[PDB]
């Protein structure tokens, strides 16, 4: 039939480094999670065919995360600026990506989008070439990403790897 | 899988 893949990341700044979190789904099932709040910060596969993997696989995955975190830390601060927000408080940037493939295996829709403090911030349109900007701050971001070629960067992923992986994954089941 | 995100905001 049809299928889907989603991955969510959230970073929450602290009054006192941001609490980073992630979780992945295919077909409304969790297949991995991460939380920098349990005593060991390590990825927890939730599905049999993932658990059986080399620990140098999970190593590289983890290395990537440390980067992504540092990215969140920097940009979280980029937002408080955009919104004239007090330095002392607590804010949450969240990000989701993924794809829906149809019955045919052909991508049916791709996603890439951020929400900030609960509210929609920016999101890649179904065309995979344009962005939708919730407000005045978001358009700034959009401009940067328009000129930087962000949409193209992620089309490559969404139309190719995002679909290829979902397939192998579903097959490994 | 991974599609890290690095573009500035």
């Amino acid at each position: 039939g049809p299928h889907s893949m989603r991955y969510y990341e959230t970073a929450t700044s602290r009054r006192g480094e941001p609490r980073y979190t992630s979780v992945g789904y295919v077909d409304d099932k969790e297949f991995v999670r991460f939380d920098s709040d349990a005593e060991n910060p390590r990825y927890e596969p939730q599905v049999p065919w993932m658990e059986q993997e080399g620990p140098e696989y999970w190593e590289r995955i983890t290395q990537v995360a440390k980067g992504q975190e540092q990215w969140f830390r920097v940009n979280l601060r980029t937002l408080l600026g955009y919104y004239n927000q007090s330095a002392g408080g607590t804010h949450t940037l969240q990000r989701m990506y993924g794809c829906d493939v149809g019955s045919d295996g052909r991508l049916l829709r791709g996603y890439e989008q951020f929400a900030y403090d609960g509210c929609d911030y920016i999101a890649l349109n179904e065309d995979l070439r344009t962005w939708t900007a919730a407000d005045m701050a978001a358009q700034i971001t959009r401009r940067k990403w328009e000129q930087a070629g962000a949409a193209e960067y992620y089309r490559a992923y969404l139309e190719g790897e995002c679909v290829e992986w979902l397939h192998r994954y579903l097959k490994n089941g | 899988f991974l599609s890290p995100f690095w573009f500035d905001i």
Partner: T-cell receptor, first 111, second 114 residues
Framework: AAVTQSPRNKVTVTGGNVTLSCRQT?????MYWYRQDTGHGLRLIHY???????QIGDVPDGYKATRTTQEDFFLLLELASPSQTSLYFC??????????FGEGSKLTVLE | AQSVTQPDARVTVSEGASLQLRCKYS??????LFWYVQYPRQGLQMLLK??????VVQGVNGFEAEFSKSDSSFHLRKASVHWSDSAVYFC????????????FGKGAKLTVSP
Amino acid sequence: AAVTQSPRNKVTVTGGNVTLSCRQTNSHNYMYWYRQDTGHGLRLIHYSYGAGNLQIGDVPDGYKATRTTQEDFFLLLELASPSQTSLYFCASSDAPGQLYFGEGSKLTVLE
Amino acid sequence: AQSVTQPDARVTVSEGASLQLRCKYSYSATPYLFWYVQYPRQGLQMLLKYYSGDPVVQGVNGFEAEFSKSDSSFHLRKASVHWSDSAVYFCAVSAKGTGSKLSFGKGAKLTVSP
């Protein structure tokens, strides 16, 4: 385009202190310090995601970096060694793989 | 693991001739690719990027590159090289996860004979 290194030229003797500065007027979050030597191409010394972050690069030994503010990134050779005679490039970025370079700082450390 | 390889460090051609600089990339999906140029006594300049889409990328200065999935190829091309195009040309991929960092080729020093 405006990523500017200071000083363009510098000579010092083994044991000396050297400080290469780099200013970027884009509002880029990433900044990088590279060296370039014939036979080794471009090698990354240290970089930074954004203000107050440092990341080690491929050849950090002997160098420290400081990202005080959003637009200033400094390379610091606190005890300079002949090995370090070379040409250094600063670069800013706001997207994967897209770096905007400064013009070079040529440094000789004399034994 | 994600490298890119340039075959020749030194290369010479004649004013007017047509240029092809070879760049092969270690396999990755999905590849993000770049050509940078370094004019004498200067820094690197981004020539062009390939993120997705048209596998024939138009850079500035009448340069262009062709993304070949088939080959693992990202060849840089110009039709009629003038002399001012003498410079060093760098190929580069932006690994994923290794994405904050750009990973360079060795470089190709191009000499356009007048």
